[PDB]
Amino acid sequence: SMADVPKELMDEIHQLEDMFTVDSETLRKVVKHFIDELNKGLTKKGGNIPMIPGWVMEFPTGKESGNYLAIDLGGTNLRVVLVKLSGNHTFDTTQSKYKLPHDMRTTKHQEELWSFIADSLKDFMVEQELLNTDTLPLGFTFSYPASQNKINEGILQRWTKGFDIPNVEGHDVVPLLQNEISKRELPIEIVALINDTVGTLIASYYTDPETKMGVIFGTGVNGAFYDVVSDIEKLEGKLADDIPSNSPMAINCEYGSFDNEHLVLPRTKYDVAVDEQSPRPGQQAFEKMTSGYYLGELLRLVLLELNEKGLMLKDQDLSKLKQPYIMDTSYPARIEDDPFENLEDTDDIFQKDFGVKTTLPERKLIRRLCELIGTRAARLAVCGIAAICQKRGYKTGHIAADGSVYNKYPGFKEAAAKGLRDIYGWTGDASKDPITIVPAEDGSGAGAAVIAALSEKRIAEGKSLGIIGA
Ligand SMILES: OC[C@H]1O[C@@H](O)[C@H](O)[C@@H](O)[C@@H]1O
């Protein structure tokens, strides 16, 4: 409880509560502007929300069959996956995991990244003995901003989620990987570049036709959904006749860039601080305050400012806490996950990891802080779901969700659901909820394979997969 915390700290906890609490009226405010930005991003003039086409113009039926490869570039490790779509409305996947070398996510020699992915593919080929012969369709899940005018293209906009490699931005990633595959004479062809949220949208629809959206609450945030071609104004008169107006089209929103103008989001001085000190300030406004990548950075700055104010961690060595992005989301997650009255797990963390001693009330505050920024992250993140469900007329449906924060972060699922009930105003038992958030399918694995299948079928039918002349 709080029945033994000094008045100095209780007054700070009350202010932190007031700034990190987002009521239902504010959520509804954010959502309305969110909807405008979604529409604006579909016009030629554009907007801060990219609204990138995914070039998937069909719903998976289940009758899809074949052997498709699918790689997934995460920040921690590369994931090669073989997917046998049986057509029984399920799949059989043989996968591998290849750890990323130390400085890889940050390497100055970009050729090492592609060289790594290609070599890892060859190992998977020899271990699965599938190095005889058709050309294996490959689905490449590249979950970073990348505009695409056709499905087998991905021009890197900017690195996120801890990635920083020199000469890849503004470049098509696909040929980089493709002509590395061909140097090793591997029987692979990149048939599709897919965003993790889109692969998720499709993998889940494949096994749940009630899937209205595929969202990621992970080290990054993003959401994909099926729109209709006619709604996408910017593609007006840039498409072939095999892509009609009533046609479905998976949209990769890339809405982590929402409100870069800063006109609705309840940013605080700590939020502004995180932004100003981040690699590229003025970017990812929405993402910076809901994303797993930044949640710990928030905690770090609040702790630092409360210290440089003679209120907390007095006469302690904050030498280790001074390093930016030293705290990832595991810290808030583990602090909130502390089962002990005296918060003994938390104590151990600041001692072993940062070499700083805390009193009991100091951990009482740290803990309540992790609750506030985590609950706000949830309540704000679901504003993208309500916005999409309302721009389209989705009265009911399932939202396929994945991500390390959705999955691992304590009480996040509950918070995201309550945040969603507050926005709509729903009252009673949660089973009555017309729209619910459900655990997603394998988006980067199964999903990408299901998209390679849908893509090869169009190639075979001679039909297009991008804008004319792309
Ligand atoms: O990983 C989830 C999301 O992370 C964001 O940082 C990227 O821009 C998106 O492409 C991705 O969908």
Is residue 132 annotated as involved in ligand binding? no
Among the listed residues 192, 65, 187, the one whose alpha carbon sits nearest the alpha carbon of residue 136: 187
Handedness of CA 330, 333, 335, 341 (dihedral sign): negative
Q: Is the CB of 144 under 6 A from ligand 1?
A: yes
CA 469 to chain centre: 31
Q: Is 228 helix (H, G, I), strand (E, B) or coil?
A: strand
Output the CA 256–ligand 1 centroid distance in Å.
Answer: 8
Output the CA 156–ligand 1 centroid distance in Å.
Answer: 12
Output the CA angle 219-220-223, nearest 5 degrees. 135
Residues 126, 199: Cα–Cα separation, whole Å: 26
Q: Would you say 38 and 30 are in contact if contact means Cβ atoms under 8 Å apart?
A: no
Residues 4, 360: Cα–Cα separation, whole Å: 9
What dihedral angle (degrees, nearest 10) is formed by the CA atoms of 201, 401, 333, 314? Answer: 70
251 beta partners: 53, 225
Could you tell me how many residues make up the chain? 470
Is residue 196 annotated as involved in ligand binding? yes
Output the CA angle 295-301-304, nearest 5 degrees. 145
246 beta partners: none
Residue 247 is among the residues annotated as catalytic for this protein: no
Query: Which of 172, 196, 347, 442 does the annotation list as catalytic?
Result: 196
Q: Would you say 309 and 303 are in contact if contact means Cβ atoms under 8 Å apart?
A: no
Residue 183: Cβ-neighbour burial (10 angstroms; 0-12, 13-18, 19+)? exposed
Please give the domain boundaries of the chain with CATH numbers for all domains.
1-62 (1.10.287.1250), 63-195 (3.30.420.40), 196-470 (3.40.367.20)
Q: Which atom of ligand 1 is nearest to the CA of 293?
A: 6
Output the CA 422–ligand 1 centroid distance in Å.
Answer: 26
Residues 293, 283: Cα–Cα separation, whole Å: 14
Element (H, E) at 293: helix 292-307
Residues 385, 34: Cα–Cα separation, whole Å: 10
Spell 403-440 as b/e; 16+ CB within 10 A means b. Answer: bbbbeebbebbebbbbbbbbbbebeeeeeeeebebeeb
Sheet with strand 248-252: strands edge to edge: 52-53, 248-252, 221-228, 211-217, 397-402, 435-439
Residues 335, 343: Cα–Cα separation, whole Å: 8
Q: Would you say 44 and 113 are in contact if contact means Cβ atoms under 8 Å apart?
A: no
DSSP letter for 466, please: B
Q: Is the CB of 256 under 6 A from ligand 1?
A: yes
Element (H, E) at 366: helix 360-381
Which alpha helices (DSSP H) does 382-442 contain, by range? 383-391, 404-408, 412-424
* Residues with Cβ within 8 Å of residue 344, at least 6 apart in sequence: 338
Residue 239: Cβ-neighbour burial (10 angstroms; 0-12, 13-18, 19+)? buried
Which tokens hold the place of 382? 């679901």
Output the CA 207–ligand 1 centroid distance in Å.
Answer: 23
Query: Which of 79, 120, 143, 347 does the annotation list as catalytic?
Result: 143
Residue 158 is among the residues annotated as catalytic for this protein: yes
Write the Ramachandran bin of 107: left for phi over 0, alpha for psi from -120 to 50, otherwise beta: beta
Amino acid in position 118: A
Residues 377, 416: Cα–Cα separation, whole Å: 9
The structure tokens 């993003």 sit at 222
Q: Would you say 156 and 173 are in contact if contact means Cβ atoms under 8 Å apart?
A: yes
Give the end-to-end CA distance of the chain in Å, rounded to a whole number: 62
The structure tokens 């591998």 sit at 96
Which tokens hold the place of 31? 């959502």
Number of CB atoms found within 10 A of residue 275's CB: 20
Q: Is the CB of 402 under 6 A from ligand 1?
A: no
Which tokens hold the place of 147? 């505009």
Residues 348, 364: Cα–Cα separation, whole Å: 14
Q: Which atom of ligand 1 is nearest to the CA of 196?
A: 12
The structure tokens 């098509």 sit at 172
Main-chain phi, psi angles of 298, to 5 degrees: -60, -50
Element (H, E) at 351: helix 344-352
Which tokens hold the place of 169? 């931005």
Experimental approach: X-ray
Q: Is the CB of 291 under 6 A from ligand 1?
A: no
Amino acid in position 102: H
Output the CA angle 383-387-389, nearest 5 degrees. 120
Q: What is each CA distance from 433 to 28, 30, 306, 401, 439, in whole angstroms?
A: 17, 21, 41, 16, 16
* Residues with Cβ within 8 Å of residue 184, at least 6 apart in sequence: 118, 119, 122
Among the listed residues 233, 264, 261, the one whose alpha carbon sits nearest the alpha carbon of residue 46: 233
Q: Is the CB of 152 under 6 A from ligand 1?
A: no
Q: Which atom of ligand 1 is nearest to the CA of 161?
A: 6
Is residue 145 annotated as involved in ligand binding? no
DSSP letter for 103, please: G
Number of CB atoms found within 10 A of residue 91's CB: 22
Going by alpha carbons, the residue nearest to atom 7 of ligand 1 is 144
**Biggest CA-to-CA distance, the chain:** 74
Residues 289, 455: Cα–Cα separation, whole Å: 36
Q: Ligand 1 pocket check: which of 194, 197, 255, 294 to mutate, most ligand atoms within 8 Å of Cβ?
A: 197
CA 255 to chain centre: 10
Residues 228, 396: Cα–Cα separation, whole Å: 18
CA 464 to chain centre: 28
Residue 36 is among the residues annotated as catalytic for this protein: no
Q: What is each CA distance from 209 to 34, 83, 246, 400, in whole angstroms?
A: 26, 21, 19, 11
